[PDB]
Structure formats: structure tokens, C-alpha cells
């Protein structure tokens, strides 16, 4: 007339690939087929197959964590160029164009500048 949780005890205690396979075996124990449409959408959202709402047109894109001053102020990359000749004028035009470019990353802009440096260094 007493529960099975009161009675004699042992008294003996008081208070890699193996792990991956055991985890995937624990995954199976709750591995049921889909029950309805909402569950299917939830599974696709978790797997990343379905878009995430509300729609964010810039989802999964961060532009290398760049900030605006790395796009809009590109004139620190003109330090090795001439400071007061016509080459300064041309490269100022180039950087003004590049700083208005929403389709390029900072790396591609600085690569353009470095190509210009190389070409003008040769010539």
C-alpha cells in the first residue's frame, strides 16, 4: 500500500564518432512523419529551404560587416598616388565614382584602386 519510490536502495552512489552516432540515434526516437501542412512549413524553415518571414530582401548578406565610411570615404587609398598632379584629379574622379557604387563590396573597390596604382607605377 505504498509507492514503488519508497523502500530499500543500493546506497552505492550519492549525487568522437561514438558521440555523433549516439546523438543521431537519439534523433531517431522522435522521428515521425509530418502531420499537416504547418509542420511541413516548419520543417522547411528549420532546414533553411523556406524563406524567413517577414521578407527581408537583405537576408543572409552582411557585406563583410562593412560600414558606410568604408564605402563612402575611399580617399585614404590614394595616399601613395601623386598629391597635386592630374593623376590626383583622375583618381579623385575614380574614387567619387566608386563611392557611389552600391553593387560592389569594399574589397572590389580597393582592388580597382590597387590595379590603378600598379598600372600608373609601371607607366
Amino acid at each position: 500500500r505504498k509507492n514503488i519510490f519508497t523502500g530499500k536502495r543500493l546506497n552505492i552512489f550519492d549525487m568522437s564518432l561514438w558521440d555523433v552516432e549516439f546523438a543521431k540515434q537519439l534523433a531517431t526516437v522522435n522521428e515521425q512523419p509530418l502531420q499537416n501542412g504547418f509542420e511541413e512549413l516548419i520543417q522547411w524553415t528549420k532546414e533553411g529551404k523556406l524563406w524567413e518571414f517577414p521578407i527581408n530582401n537583405e537576408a543572409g548578406f552582411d557585406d563583410d560587416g562593412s560600414e558606410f565610411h568604408e564605402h563612402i570615404f575611399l580617399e585614404k587609398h590614394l595616399e601613395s598616388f601623386p598629391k597635386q598632379g592630374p593623376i590626383r584629379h583622375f583618381m579623385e574622379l575614380v574614387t567619387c565614382g566608386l563611392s557611389k557604387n552600391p553593387y560592389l563590396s569594399v574589397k572590389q573597390k580597393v582592388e580597382h584602386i590597387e590595379w590603378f596604382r600598379n598600372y600608373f607605377n609601371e607607366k
Partner: peptide, 12 residues
């Protein structure tokens, strides 16, 4: 088996 169950519930 009951002893083992009691041990598990005792050791947290």
C-alpha cells in the same frame, strides 16, 4: 530492478 530505479531517483 526496483533497487536500481530507487538508486537512479536518489542520485539525481
Amino acid at each position: 530492478a526496483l533497487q536500481v530505479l530507487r538508486e537512479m531517483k536518489a542520485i539525481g
